Amino acid sequence: MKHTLPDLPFDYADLEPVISHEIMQLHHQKHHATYVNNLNQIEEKLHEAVSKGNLKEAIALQPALKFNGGGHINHSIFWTNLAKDGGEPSKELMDTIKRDFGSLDNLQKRLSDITIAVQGSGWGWLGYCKKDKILKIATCANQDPLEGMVPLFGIDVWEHAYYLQYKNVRPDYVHAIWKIANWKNISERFANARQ
């Protein structure tokens, strides 16, 4: 069925002073909504090419599906990943963070560093690899969804995610976002990944 823009789990000003209401409103109501609207159109075109047996046309639509579909997936996760009252990692997630990264401080530094280092637009991710049964960190370009591991916590480093507030100073945003990481949600995603 048709994709829709999910409501935010909070009001647009609820993450201040870490992310402005200006940013939250544009990011959700314009940027995410555009991915949803475009995704619905691209899925319809792809379904048509598949049904008509137009293989070249189906292949040609793949970048648009990955871009808008990835945009929808990424931002849908990102909204649930943010909270004013995030809380603390679950006992099991904390244990696993300690096992895989030494400490929460180490994880935060390492993920912040690779996220800050993204050239152009993209995302940093904490994920869970089900095959190796370990936490891992990665970056993705543009809206490429995190693949091969289950996403737990994502940091959007497209310039639109921070520029109105932070201007060029991307590291201030990336370090600050940890203050609003929704550990309740991240812990739920971790529990789900290990089932």
**Using CB under 8 A as the criterion, which residues of the chain lie in contact with a copy of itself when the complex forms?**
1, 3, 43, 46-47, 50, 53, 55-56, 58-60, 62, 65-66, 69-70, 72-73, 145, 147
Query: Which residue lies nearer to a copy of itself by CB, 31 or 175?
Result: 31
Q: Which does 58 bind (CB under 5 to 8 A by kind): Mn ion, a copy of itself, none?
A: a copy of itself
Q: Which does 6 bind (CB under 5 to 8 A by kind): a copy of itself, Mn ion, none?
A: none
Of residues 34, 35, 171, 191, the one with CA closest to residue 108: 171
Of residues 8, 37, 38, 44, the one with CA closest to residue 24: 8
Minimum gap (Å) between residue 177 Cβ and a copy of itself: 23
Query: Which residue lies nearer to a copy of itself by CB, 15 or 58?
Result: 58
3-state secondary structure of 124: strand
- Please tell me the distance from the alpha carbon of residue 114 to that of residue 98, in angstroms, as a whole number: 19
Q: Is 175 annotated as a binding residue?
A: no
Q: Is 75 annotated as a binding residue?
A: yes
Amino acid at 9: P
> Which one of 20, 156, 182, 190 is in contact with Mn ion (CB under 5 A)?
156
Q: Is 27 annotated as a binding residue?
A: yes
Name the DSSP class of 31. Answer: I
Q: Is 160 annotated as a binding residue?
A: yes
- Please tell me the distance from the alpha carbon of residue 145 to that of residue 193, in angstroms, as a whole number: 16
Q: Residue 181: beta bridge partners? A: 82
